[PDB]
Amino acid sequence: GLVPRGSHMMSIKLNSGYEMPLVGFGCWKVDNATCADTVYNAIKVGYRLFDAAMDYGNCKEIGEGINRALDEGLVARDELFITSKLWNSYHDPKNVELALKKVLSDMKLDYIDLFLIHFPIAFKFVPFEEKYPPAFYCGDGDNFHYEDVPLLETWKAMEKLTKGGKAKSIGISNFSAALIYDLLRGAEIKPAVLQIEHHPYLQQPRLIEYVQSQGIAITAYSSFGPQSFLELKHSKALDTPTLFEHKTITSIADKYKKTPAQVLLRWASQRDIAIIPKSNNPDRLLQNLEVNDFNLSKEDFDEISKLDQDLRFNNPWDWDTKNRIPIFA
Amino acid sequence: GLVPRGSHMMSIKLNSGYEMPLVGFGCWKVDNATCADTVYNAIKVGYRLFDAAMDYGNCKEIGEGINRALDEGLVARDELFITSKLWNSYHDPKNVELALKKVLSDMKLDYIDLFLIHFPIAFKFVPFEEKYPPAFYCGDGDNFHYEDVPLLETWKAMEKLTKGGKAKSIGISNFSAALIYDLLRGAEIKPAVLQIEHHPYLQQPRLIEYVQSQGIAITAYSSFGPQSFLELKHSKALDTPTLFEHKTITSIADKYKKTPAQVLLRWASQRDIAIIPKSNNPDRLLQNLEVNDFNLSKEDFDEISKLDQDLRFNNPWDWDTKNRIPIFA
Ligand SMILES: NC(=O)C1=CN([C@@H]2O[C@H](COP(=O)(O)OP(=O)(O)OC[C@H]3O[C@@H](n4cnc5c(N)ncnc54)[C@H](OP(=O)(O)O)[C@@H]3O)[C@@H](O)[C@H]2O)C=C[C@H]1SC[C@H](O)[C@@H](O)CS
Ligand SMILES: NC(=O)C1=CN([C@@H]2O[C@H](COP(=O)(O)OP(=O)(O)OC[C@H]3O[C@@H](n4cnc5c(N)ncnc54)[C@H](OP(=O)(O)O)[C@@H]3O)[C@@H](O)[C@H]2O)C=C[C@H]1SC[C@H](O)[C@@H](O)CS
Prior knowledge:
The structure is a homodimer of 329-residue chains.
Chain A: E1 11-13, E2 19-21, E3 25-26, H1 32-45, E4 49-51, H2 59-71, E5 81-86, H3 93-107, E6 112-117, H4 151-163, E7 167-173, H5 177-186, E8 193-197, H6 205-213, E9 217-221, H7 227-230, H8 235-238, H9 247-256, H10 260-269, E10 273-274, H11 284-289, H12 298-305
Parallel strand pairs in A: 3-4, 4-5, 5-6, 6-7, 7-8, 8-9, 9-10
Antiparallel strand pairs in A: 1-2
The structure holds a molecule of 2 linked components (NDP-DTT) (2 copies).
A molecule of 2 linked components (NDP-DTT) binds next to helix 7 and helix 11 of chain A.
C-alpha cells in the first residue's frame, strides 16, 4: 500500500459521496457450485467490488463467500463494494423495496453499496416463490408480458431506498443517453452509475461523453467483447474476430509486456470507466486485477477508436420475437 | 379520380381514426415573402397536407395561402391536413395549450389535424412577445437553458388538446425508439405519428419496425438527405455524395423513367412512410407529388438498404456546445 504506481485500489468518487473501486469481479455465469469459493478467493487476492444481480441466480453463494471473508477478518464490510441490480419483473414501485429486501436476505447483508435498474424494461411481476430468478418468465409459458410503469416511477422508488441506507447508492444499466436525459428531468437524486456494454467494437463515445459530463460514473461490462457469449453459442459472437488476437490490440499489448486482455481492460479504466472482468479461473483472476500499473498512449487510444463498429452482443431485441424490445434501436 | 394507379391521393389511416395523406408539402425554409403564394399554388397543383411548425416562422403566411384557397372554394377545410409542431420552449404542460392557440391564431384556423412534439428537448420558456419564433433563445444571450419537464408530462398535456378537438391527432418527432417505448407506458392516447429524419443514408430499420408494429404512422423528413442542408453550409452535408447522383439510385431511376428524386421519395412512401418534400420551385412541385404511380422492386429495396451508414444531418448534439444534447447518442 506504499508503492506509487497505479493498482487495483484506485477508485471513483461517486456523486453520492461514496468511493467505488475501479476494478471489480463480475459474477454473471460464475457457477453456483463453486461461486462461494471463487468469491472468497477473489477477496483473498484483493478484489473488493463484486458485481451481482437478481437475475444471476448465485446471490446466496456470493453472500456465503463474502461472509466467510468477513467472519475470518480478511476484510471489513465497509471495504467491500457490493452491487446488485433490480430485475425487469420488479419495476412497479410497490415491488422495488421488496426486491432489495430479497437481495439482502439472500446475500445475508445489511446493505448493498449500489442498486441498479438492470434494464429499461418492465416485465409483468412474478412472485419470488413462483420463480426466482424469474428471468424471461412472465406468468404465461414462453410469452412475454409487460407492465406500464414509466421508468421515472421506478426511479422514484429507488430514490426512497437510499434514505434508509439499505442501498448506499443507486443507478441504472442499459439506458440510452436519450433515456438518461429524460430521467434526470424528474430525478431528485441523479444516478450514481450507468453500467453498459462497452468494448472496442461498441464504444458509444457520445454516450460516454454526455454521461460523464453529468458526473455519473460508468461501469463497463463485457470488456472482452464477444468472449463472454461464446459459451452460450451466441451466433454473432461466434462469427466475430476475437479482440484477443486483433492486430491493433496485440501490437499495443506488445509495447507494454501486457496481455491483450490487460490492454482491453486498461483501455476502459484509464478513461475512468470502471471494469468488472469475470473469471471462474483463479489464474486470470490476478492478471485482471493488475491492469492499472501501465498507461496506454494517446496514439493507442486513437488506434483503438478505429475499431468501433456499433457491434452490440447483449441486445434485448432478440429476446421477444412477438413484441420487439427496442431499447437500443 | 378514376384512374386505377397510385397517386398523391393515397393516405394512411391513423390510429386516431383520421386519414393522413401519404404525400404532403414541407414548409421548412419556404421563404416568408412568397410562402402564401407557394402554398396556394401547391393546393392548386393538388397538395393537401402541409407540414408546418412553430419554429419555422412562416405560420401566418401558410395560413394566408390556405385561407385564400378556402375562400375561393378550391378546397374544403376537411380536405386539408395541417400539421404543426410544439417547439422546445413550450414543453411545460401549462404552456402546451397556449402554444396550440398561438398556432391557430397565426394560421387563422379553427383546428389543426396533427400537433407534434417537435423534439424530446425542453428549453426554458420564452414569452411570445419577447421572441417568436424563439428558436435557440433561452432568455440569456446565446446560452441554452432547459426545463425539468419529463416528456410524459408534456404528452399528457397534448392528450388534453385532442379532447377539445382543436388538434385532431397528436404525435411526436425526433424521439428514439427507447423514448417511445417508455412514453407508451404512461400514455392514454398513443402517438398517431412519429416524424423523423429518414433517407437512404439513415434508415434506422429497427426503429421503423418497432414503431410501425405499434400502429404509429411514420413521416420522413429530409428525404433527399444532405440536400436540404447545403444552403445552410452544413459542413457534413457539403462533403456527402449527393443521393441524386448515387449509382444505386440512378440505376433504379433508369429502370422506371423516373428522376432520382422520385425514387428517393417513393422508397419511403411505398413502405407506408409519409413524405413531405419541400420546394420553393413551382416546377419540381408536381414531380414531387407524382411519385406513387410506380413501384420499386424487392431487389431495389435490397440495394438501397446497403446505403445505410447512420449518417444523421439534423442532430441537436451540435446546438449547445456547453451542455451536449444527447437525444441521438
Ligand atoms: N448490466 C448488465 O446487463 C450486465 C452486466 N454484466 C456484468 O459484467 C461482468 C463481466 O462481463 P462478462 O459478460 O461476464 O464477460 P467478460 O468479463 O467480458 O469476459 C468474460 C470471459 O472472458 C474469459 N476471460 C476472463 N479473464 C480473461 C483473461 N484475462 N484472458 C482471456 N480470457 C479471459 C472468461 O473465461 P473463464 O471464466 O474461463 O476465465 C469468460 O469467458 C459480468 O460478470 C457481470 O457482472 C455482464 C452482462 C450483463 S447481465 C447479462 C444479461 O443482461 C442477463 O442478465 C439477461 S439475458
Ligand atoms: N420534424 C423536424 O424536426 C423537421 C421536419 N422537417 C420537415 O420536412 C420537410 C422536408 O424536409 P427538408 O429538410 O425541407 O428537405 P427535402 O425535402 O429533403 O429536400 C429539400 C431540398 O431539395 C431540393 N429539391 C426539392 N425537390 C427536388 C427535386 N424534385 N429534385 C431535386 N432537388 C429537389 C429543394 O430545393 P428548391 O426549394 O430550390 O426546389 C431543397 O433544397 C421540411 O420542409 C419540413 O416540413 C424537416 C426538418 C426538421 S425541422 C428543422 C430543424 O429541426 C429546425 O426546426 C430546428 S434547428
